[PDB]
Design a protein around this ligand. Structure first.
Ligand code: FAD
Ligand code: FAD
Ligand code: RXS
Ligand code: RXS
Ligand code: BR
Ligand code: BR
Lengths: 489, 488
C-alpha cells in the first residue's frame, strides 16, 4: 500500500462536504477524496454517508412528523363528514420506523453508487484526522492510536464533520438518550420527557404524542420561561398553547437535576425544584456542539473559537491557509441548506476563479412542530435594537377550515417586520399549516430587498393562508427607538 | 327617492370592496344593491357575492373534505391502522357544515352594513333608468314593482357572471355549479362537462363523496383539459385524476340529454357514444351578467364577447358609470375584482389615479393534487420573446413513495426570458402549490431573475425549495420553436 493524492480531501460526507466534493470533481475536474465513518444509517455511529440530515436529521424527522400529522387528520376528518370506527384506530410505530429506515437506506445506497461511478470523486471509510498541513490520516476508530487504513495527501482540506448532541453532566445521565437513539426506539414510549426548548425537542414531542400507546403522556420541559428562543415571540406563545391543546404537557422554568431507575425499570426524574416525574424515556435535546475533538486539530494549529467551533472568515478559511471549514463545525447557523451553500461557494472560490461568500442573513427556515413554523429574517425585538423606527404588521385568526374541523385552537399567525423609515421588510414569521412551504419564496423577496408595498401591491391567491401576507397595509404597532407603542407619537 | 355619491349594483367581491372603501376611507354616501341577503336557492349568489356564497369559499371547504379520502388511505404507509370497511363519507354533514359557514359570513356582512356610516344595503334587482338614476325592483322583470329610486353621482356595475349553458336538446335536465352546492345526496354517477377549473375541482369533490359503486366522468370537447395552464401540468393532472378513479373523456361533447324512467340522465355525445348518469353538471364557461341591467336605457357599450367595455381605469363609454369584476369578462378572480374596486375608488374619490395590473396575477386550481401558477406559460412567452428558457423539475416526493400514492409527481417549472434571465412564469403541481406560489407573485414584482431564485438558500425539507435548485434549462424556445439546445 501507497498513499493516495488529491486536490481536495473532505472530512465528513454530509450536507456541506458532499456538495463541495461533487462540485469540485464534476464542475472543475479536481481529484477529490471524501471520508466518513459509516456507509449507512444507524448504530453505532448514527450519522453516515449523506450526513446528519439524511441519516438522523431533517429527512427522517420530516417523515415521522408527517406520520404524526395523521392523528390530527383522522380526527379533523369528522367535521367534513368522514365516519369510521374510532375505537379501531392504532398508531403502529414499528411500521413507521421500518418505512423510514428503508427510505434512508435508499439514499445511502444512491450516494454509494455515485462515488463508485464518478471520475475523480472517491469515498474512504474510517475516521479522518489531520496529521500535517497536507496529509489526512484515516484510522479504524476515533482513537488516534487505532490502526491506519489510509493516508490521503491533499493540496486543500475541508473540515465538515458536523455536530453532536450535548448531554448535561447530571447523576443518571446514562439512563437518558438523545435524538440519535429516538430514531431507533423499538417501541413508542408510553411516557416520555423531552428536555429542551428548541426545535428538536418540540418536533419530537409532536412525534411521540401521535404514536404513544393508550394512556400515554408526553412532557416537554425547558429551564427558562418560554420555549423556542430566537423565534417570534407571538409565535412562541401560540405554539405553546397549541401543543398544550393537543395533549402535550409543557413544564417551563424546570430542569432535570438527576435521573434514577425505579424498581420496575422506569425512569424517576427529579427536577431542581423538587418536582418529580416518572417516564419510560428521557430524551435530552438541550443543544448540539461542533465535532472537533477527533480531528486532532492541534497537529496543525487550527484555531477554535471560545464557543468551540472552528474559527473561519467569510470565505470559510481557517487560520491555516489551505484548510477550510463549513457547516455545523463552525457553530453558527446549523441548517443543511446553509452548509450546502457554503460548500458550493468555497469550491467556486478555490477552484472556480469566481469568489463568493455565503450570505448568513435573511435565511428562511422552518420548525416542523404541529402546526409548523416558517420564518425568514429578523424578529422585531432584534430589529428594534438596530433601527430607529420599526413597524409590525400582524394577522392572527383561526382559519375557517379549522372552525369545521374542530381544531379551533389552530390560529394562523402572519407577521411582517419592517424598517418603517423606508418600508424594507426585515423579517416574516408564520405559524400554521403550510408555513414552511409559504416562506421559501419570501426568502427570495428579502434577497431582493422587498418593501411592504411590494407585498401589498401583489394580488392574493384566494382562498389561501399565504394571501394574508399580501393584504396588510397598516401597522399593528411600532417600535420607536426601542419602545413598543400602538401609534407613532 | 334618495341621493348618493356612489351606487353599487352587486354586493360581491368587487362591489363590497369599492363600497366599503368609498364610505370608510373617503366619507362618501354609498348604496349597494343585491338580490338576496343570504346564500342558496333561488338566486344562489347573494350578499357577499359569488365567491362567498357559491364559489371560492364553499368549494375550498368541500375540496378540503374530499382530500380526506386520500389522507385516510395514505396514513397506512406511516403505520396507521383502522377498520377500512367502516369508512363512509357523509355528504349531508359536509353540505350542512358548509352552509353554516357561509351563512355566518352573510350575517357578518349584514352587521357591517348596519354598523358603518354612509353605507346602505338595498334588497332587489338594480338596473339603469338614466345616466344618474338606479332603480331597484322586486324581480328581474323590468315591469316588476319599483322599490327604490337611487340618484347617483357615480354608478358601479358589479353584477358578476353566470354559468353558460349550451343550446342542446335537454339542457334543462343538466345542472350548474350553483345547484351542485345544494344536492341532497352525493351523485353516484356524475358527468362534469368542461375542461376548466370548476369542472376539474367538482370532479375531485364528487369522486371522494360518491356512494359505493360510483363513478365520476369528466368530458372535454378538445384534446387536453385545463387550457391556459402549463402543458406539462395539464398532462400530469390528467394522469393523477385518472389514477384516483376519475374517467377523463377528451374530444367528446354532449349533443343531447334525455330523462330516464328512473330519474337518471341519458347523455348522447356528438360522436354517437352514450352515457347514463345521475347528474350532468355543465361547467363550460361563465358569462358576464348584463341582461337585467337595462344597459340600453343609457347606452353602455359592450364588447363582442358580452362584457361591459372598460378602459384601464374601469370607466365605461358613459361618463360617471364604471364596471369592475367578472362583468368586464377579463380575469374572473375574486382578488382581481377586489383590486379593481379599490383602484376605482382611489381614482374617483381621492387624488390618486390607480389602475389594476392584470399581468403576473397568481392563481390556483384546487384539484387533487392542486395547481399554483403566476405569469406566462412557455408557449405564450415564446411568441413575445426571441429566447425563452424552461427550467423543469418533476418527481414523486419521498413521502408519497411511503404513502403509496406513487402517481403524485410534484412538478415545478420556471419560464424565463433567456436574454436576461428575467422570470416570466412559474407553474407548480402538487401538495401546497397554491400556498407556495403567493410570494412568487411578489418576486415577479421585483423583476426577479432565475439567478435570484437559485442564489436564495432553501428551506429543507420542502417541495418549495425545488424553486431554488434549478440552474440549467431543460429546453428552449427560439423564435417560437422548441428545441433542446440553443443554436448558438
Ligand atoms: C434531529 C435533527 C433534525 C434536523 N432537522 C433539520 C431540518 O429540518 N432542516 C435543516 O436545515 N437542518 C436540520 N437539521 C440540521 C442539519 O442536519 C445540519 O445542519 C447539517 O446536517 C449539517 O451539515 P454538515 O455538512 O455540517 O454536517 P453533517 O451533515 O452532520 O455531516 C458530517 C458527517 O461527518 C461525519 N464525521 C464526523 N466526524 C468524522 C471524522 N472524524 N471522520 C470522518 N467522518 C466524520 C459524520 O458521520 C457525518 O456524516 C437537523 C438536525 C438534527 C440533529
Ligand atoms: C364555483 C366557483 C368557484 C370559484 N373559485 C374561485 C377561487 O378559488 N378563487 C377565485 O379567485 N375566484 C374563484 N371564483 C371566481 C369568483 O367567484 C368571481 O371572480 C368573483 O366572485 C367575482 O366578483 P364580482 O365582484 O365580479 O361579482 P360577484 O362576487 O359575482 O357578485 C355579483 C353579485 O351581484 C348580484 N347581482 C347580480 N345581478 C344583480 C342585479 N341585477 N341587481 C342586484 N344585484 C345583482 C349577485 O347576487 C351577486 O351577489 C369561483 C367562481 C365559481 C363560480
Ligand atoms: C449527486 C449530488 N449532486 C450534488 C451533490 N450530490 C451528492 C453527492 C453524492 C455523492 C458524492 C458527492 C461528493 N463529494 C456528492
Ligand atoms: C369589512 C370589509 N372590509 C372590506 C370589505 N368588507 C366587507 C363589507 C361588508 C359589508 C359591506 C361592505 C361594503 N360596501 C363591505
Ligand atoms: Br407499535
Ligand atoms: Br386542447
Amino acid at each position: 500500500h501507497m498513499s493516495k493524492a488529491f486536490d481536495l480531501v473532505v472530512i465528513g460526507a454530509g450536507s456541506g462536504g458532499l456538495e463541495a466534493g461533487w462540485n469540485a470533481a464534476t464542475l472543475y475536474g479536481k481529484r477529490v477524496a471524501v471520508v466518513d465513518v459509516q456507509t449507512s444509517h444507524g448504530p453505532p455511529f448514527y450519522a453516515a454517508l449523506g450526513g446528519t440530515c439524511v441519516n438522523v436529521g431533517c429527512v427522517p424527522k420530516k417523515l415521522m412528523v408527517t406520520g404524526a400529522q395523521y392523528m390530527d387528520h383522522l380526527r379533523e376528518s369528522a367535521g367534513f363528514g368522514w365516519e369510521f370506527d374510532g375505537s379501531s384506530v392504532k398508531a403502529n410505530w414499528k411500521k413507521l420506523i421500518a418505512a423510514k429506515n428503508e427510505a434512508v437506506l435508499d439514499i445511502n445506497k444512491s450516494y454509494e453508487g455515485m462515488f463508485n461511478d464518478t471520475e475523480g470523486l472517491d469515498f474512504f471509510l474510517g475516521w479522518g484526522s489531520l496529521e500535517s498541513k497536507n496529509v489526512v490520516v484515516v484510522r479504524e476508530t476515533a482513537d488516534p492510536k487505532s490502526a491506519v487504513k489510509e493516508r490521503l495527501q491533499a493540496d486543500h482540506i475541508l473540515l465538515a464533520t458536523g455536530s453532536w448532541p450535548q448531554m448535561p453532566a447530571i447523576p443518571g445521565i446514562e439512563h437518558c438518550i438523545s435524538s440519535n437513539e429516538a430514531f431507533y426506539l423499538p417501541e413508542p414510549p408510553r411516557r416520555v420527557l423531552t428536555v429542551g426548548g428548541g426545535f428538536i425537542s418540540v418536533e419530537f414531542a409532536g412525534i411521540f404524542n401521535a404514536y404513544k400507546p393508550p394512556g400515554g403522556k408526553v412532557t416537554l420541559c425547558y429551564r427558562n420561561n418560554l420555549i423556542l428562543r430566537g423565534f417570534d415571540e407571538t409565535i412562541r406563545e401560540e405554539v405553546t398553547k397549541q401543543l398544550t391543546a393537543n395533549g402535550i404537557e409543557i413544564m417551563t422554568n424546570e430542569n432535570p437535576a438527576k435521573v434514577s431507575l425505579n424498581t420496575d425499570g422506569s425512569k424517576h426524574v427529579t427536577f431542581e425544584s423538587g418536582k418529580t416525574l416518572d417516564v419510560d424515556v428521557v430524551m435530552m435535546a438541550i443543544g448540539r456542539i461542533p465535532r472537533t475533538n477527533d480531528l486532532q486539530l492541534g497537529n496543525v494549529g487550527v484555531k477554535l473559537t471560545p464557543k468551540g467551533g472552528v474559527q473561519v472568515d467569510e470565505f470559510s478559511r481557517t487560520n491555516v491557509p489551505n484548510i477550510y471549514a463549513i457547516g455545523d463545525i463552525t457553530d453558527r447557523l446549523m441548517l443543511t441548506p446553509v452548509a450546502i451553500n457554503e460548500g458550493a461557494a468555497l469550491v467556486d472560490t478555490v477552484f472556480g476563479n469566481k469568489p463568493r461568500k455565503t450570505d448568513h442573513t435573511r435565511v428562511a427556515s422552518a420548525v416542523f412542530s404541529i402546526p409548523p413554523i416558517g420564518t425568514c429574517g429578523l424578529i422585531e425585538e432584534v430589529a428594534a435594537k438596530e433601527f430607529e423606527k420599526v413597524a409590525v404588521y400582524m394577522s392572527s385568526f383561526t382559519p375557517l377550515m379549522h372552525n369545521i374541523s374542530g381544531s379551533k385552537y389552530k390560529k394562523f399567525v402572519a407577521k411582517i417586520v419592517t424598517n418603517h423609515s423606508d418600508g424594507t421588510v426585515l423579517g416574516v414569521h408564520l405559524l400554521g399549516d403550510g408555513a414552511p412551504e409559504i416562506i421559501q419564496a419570501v426568502g427570495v423577496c428579502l434577497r431582493l430587498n422587498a418593501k411592504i408595498s411590494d407585498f401589498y401591491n401583489t394580488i392574493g391567491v384566494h382562498p389561501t393562508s399565504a394571501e394574508e401576507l399580501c393584504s396588510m397595509r397598516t401597522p399593528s404597532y411600532y417600535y420607536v427607538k426601542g419602545e413598543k407603542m400602538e401609534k407613532l407619537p
